[PDB]
Structure formats: structure tokens, C-alpha cells
Design an enzyme around this catalytic site. Sequence first.
Site, PDB file in Angstrom:
ATOM      1  N   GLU A  77       0.955  -1.084   0.091  1.00  0.00           N
ATOM      2  CA  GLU A  77       0.133   0.019   0.095  1.00  0.00           C
ATOM      3  C   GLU A  77       0.881   1.208   0.038  1.00  0.00           C
ATOM      4  O   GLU A  77       0.288   2.154  -0.285  1.00  0.00           O
ATOM      5  CB  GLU A  77      -0.670   0.138   1.234  1.00  0.00           C
ATOM      6  CG  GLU A  77      -1.824  -1.190   1.541  1.00  0.00           C
ATOM      7  CD  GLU A  77      -2.845  -0.863   0.698  1.00  0.00           C
ATOM      8  OE1 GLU A  77      -3.187   0.075   0.120  1.00  0.00           O
ATOM      9  OE2 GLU A  77      -3.735  -1.955   0.217  1.00  0.00           O
ATOM     10  N   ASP A 129      -7.153   6.758  -4.363  1.00  0.00           N
ATOM     11  CA  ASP A 129      -6.536   5.451  -4.280  1.00  0.00           C
ATOM     12  C   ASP A 129      -6.666   5.177  -5.788  1.00  0.00           C
ATOM     13  O   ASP A 129      -7.157   6.199  -6.542  1.00  0.00           O
ATOM     14  CB  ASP A 129      -7.080   4.470  -3.129  1.00  0.00           C
ATOM     15  CG  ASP A 129      -8.588   4.050  -3.481  1.00  0.00           C
ATOM     16  OD1 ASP A 129      -9.271   4.244  -4.893  1.00  0.00           O
ATOM     17  OD2 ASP A 129      -9.133   3.627  -2.387  1.00  0.00           O
ATOM     18  N   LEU A 151      -8.561   3.959   3.858  1.00  0.00           N
ATOM     19  CA  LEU A 151      -9.495   4.778   3.306  1.00  0.00           C
ATOM     20  C   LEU A 151     -10.452   5.741   3.838  1.00  0.00           C
ATOM     21  O   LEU A 151     -11.014   5.165   4.991  1.00  0.00           O
ATOM     22  CB  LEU A 151     -10.644   3.733   2.566  1.00  0.00           C
ATOM     23  CG  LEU A 151     -11.913   4.143   1.778  1.00  0.00           C
ATOM     24  CD1 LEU A 151     -11.622   5.013   0.627  1.00  0.00           C
ATOM     25  CD2 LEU A 151     -12.597   3.133   1.322  1.00  0.00           C
ATOM     26  N   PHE A 164      -8.125  -6.766   4.109  1.00  0.00           N
ATOM     27  CA  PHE A 164      -7.824  -5.333   4.433  1.00  0.00           C
ATOM     28  C   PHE A 164      -8.114  -4.307   3.123  1.00  0.00           C
ATOM     29  O   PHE A 164      -8.395  -3.288   3.275  1.00  0.00           O
ATOM     30  CB  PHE A 164      -6.123  -5.468   4.642  1.00  0.00           C
ATOM     31  CG  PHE A 164      -5.521  -4.085   4.967  1.00  0.00           C
ATOM     32  CD1 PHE A 164      -5.341  -3.019   3.844  1.00  0.00           C
ATOM     33  CD2 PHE A 164      -5.502  -3.747   6.231  1.00  0.00           C
ATOM     34  CE1 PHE A 164      -4.772  -1.846   4.102  1.00  0.00           C
ATOM     35  CE2 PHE A 164      -4.896  -2.307   6.535  1.00  0.00           C
ATOM     36  CZ  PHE A 164      -4.502  -1.352   5.564  1.00  0.00           C
ATOM     37  N   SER A 196     -13.502 -19.425  -4.985  1.00  0.00           N
ATOM     38  CA  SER A 196     -12.013 -19.358  -4.358  1.00  0.00           C
ATOM     39  C   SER A 196     -11.916 -20.081  -3.116  1.00  0.00           C
ATOM     40  O   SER A 196     -10.905 -20.784  -2.949  1.00  0.00           O
ATOM     41  CB  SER A 196     -11.449 -18.159  -4.639  1.00  0.00           C
ATOM     42  OG  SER A 196     -11.808 -17.639  -5.832  1.00  0.00           O
ATOM     43  N   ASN A 253      -8.846 -19.169 -10.391  1.00  0.00           N
ATOM     44  CA  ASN A 253     -10.022 -18.548 -10.071  1.00  0.00           C
ATOM     45  C   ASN A 253     -10.014 -17.083  -9.429  1.00  0.00           C
ATOM     46  O   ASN A 253     -10.813 -16.411  -9.597  1.00  0.00           O
ATOM     47  CB  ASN A 253     -10.939 -19.493  -9.134  1.00  0.00           C
ATOM     48  CG  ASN A 253     -12.628 -19.042  -8.903  1.00  0.00           C
ATOM     49  OD1 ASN A 253     -12.563 -18.492  -7.942  1.00  0.00           O
ATOM     50  ND2 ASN A 253     -13.198 -19.451  -9.834  1.00  0.00           N
TER      51      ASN A 253
END
Length: 162
Positions: free
Chosen positions: A11, A20, A32, A104, A117, A132
Site C-alpha cells: 500500500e 486511491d 480509506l 484489508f 475461490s 479462479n
Amino acid sequence: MNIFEMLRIDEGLRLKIYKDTEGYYTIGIGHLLTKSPSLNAAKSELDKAIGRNTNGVITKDEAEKLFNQDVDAAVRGILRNAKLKPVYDSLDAVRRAAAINMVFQMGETGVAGFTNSLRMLQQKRWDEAAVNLAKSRWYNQTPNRAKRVITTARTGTWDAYK
Ligand SMILES: [Cl-]
Ligand SMILES: [Cl-]
């Protein structure tokens, strides 16, 4: 290598409000702030989050405090989720870091969404799960980070990050 160092790589660290990949007002380590177009709504959330008047700028420390809260919230969110918890319990510690990365970044709800998945992960069908996971907007939107997370899940090693 641990979940904190893995996320700090994915990040980055930014001391001033920014946008972002999706276009949302974010600060520090992937925190965020809001989906609202207003830079003023963002500044608002920001000061609420920090407990002071920031004017859109924070310290490293502040940024670190926020990151600590978010990883903790991520973990607790996984453990509290009926879909997520069993997958997690079933995994080794490296793979677990991978599910934590995902949660996250896309929220509990999003990840809980990855039905298929998740099922492959639990059945420890690594390669198929990898394939997948790649058939998603997530992967198409931020492919270099998604590839790294996906490899961590497929392998149980930290290769992609070394
Ligand atoms: Cl907060
Ligand atoms: Cl990317």
C-alpha cells in the site's frame, strides 16, 4: 516477513490525503477515508479518525496507529465472519497472511463474496484457487499487487515479496 511488512509494501505510506486506484480519498498506509468526492468530507473523516485538526496532513506515528487499527479490524472481521472463519482456520500461517491482505484491501464483505475461490482454498486445491482468484475485477484493476497475493496463497511462501 509478516502481514505488517507485507501490507506496507503493497500500500505504501503517504502522509497527505491522496486518491486511491479507484479514486477514493485515502491517507497513511492504505487507510480509506471516504468514497465521497468531497475533499472536505475527506478532511472531516480524517480529523475524526485522528482526534485532531489535521488539514489533510498526518505524522508517521499517526499513520502507524491507523494501520495497527486496521490490521486488527481485518483479523477480527475474519474471525467474526461465518464464511471467512472456517477457511482461515484451515490454513497455514503464510496463506493466512494472504486472506488478511485481501480483507484489508477489499473488505470482509467483498472477500466473503469469493465463494468459489474460498471453497478451493479450504480444500487446499492451490493451483485451481489461484486461477479462479485471477478471474476478478480486483486482479484486473491492480494486477501486480493481486499477483503477489495470489502467489502467497498458491504457495504458502513469501517469494513474491522477496
Ligand atoms: Cl477510524
Ligand atoms: Cl497493481
